[PDB]
Amino acid sequence: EKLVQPTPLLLSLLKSAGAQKETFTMKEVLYHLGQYIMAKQLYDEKQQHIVHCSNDPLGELFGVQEFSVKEHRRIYAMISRNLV
Ligand SMILES: CC(C)(C)C[C@@H]1N[C@@H](C(=O)NCC[C@H](O)CO)[C@H](c2cccc(Cl)c2)[C@@]1(C#N)c1ccc(Cl)cc1
């Protein structure tokens, strides 16, 4: 319900994944990031909850080389450091 403003670099990732605006609900951000993950096939083939991103823009924005899609509190925290 409350809205968030992604910083410019996060925003650019979201638009590369189909976002067509600049303010979002957390849910919409998570959705486009999920699609971005799928589109770049950042997930591990065998351990599919794991995202490899040391060589991806997301890795630098999130400050991690790997993380799990199931780590929701951690994912919120990584996203929050990229919201205005
Ligand atoms: C599966 C897919 C497409 C990557 C989407 C994920 N799929 C959501 C997820 O938890 N998948 C694992 C479910 C597990 O197998 C138990 O059933 C994940 C998500 C959903 C809601 C809140 C958060 Cl914080 C994260 C996911 C979404 N949507 C996601 C979005 C962005 C990021 Cl950065 C990481 C995970």
From Swiss-Prot:
Gene: mdm2
Protein name listed in UniProt: E3 ubiquitin-protein ligase Mdm2
SWIB/MDM2 domain span: 2-84
Full-protein interval shown: 21 to 104 of 473
Family in the record: Belongs to the MDM2/MDM4 family.
Organism listed in the record: Xenopus laevis
Localization annotation: Nucleus, Nucleoplasm; Cytoplasm; Nucleus, Nucleolus; Nucleus
Function: E3 ubiquitin-protein ligase that mediates ubiquitination of p53/TP53, leading to its degradation by the proteasome.
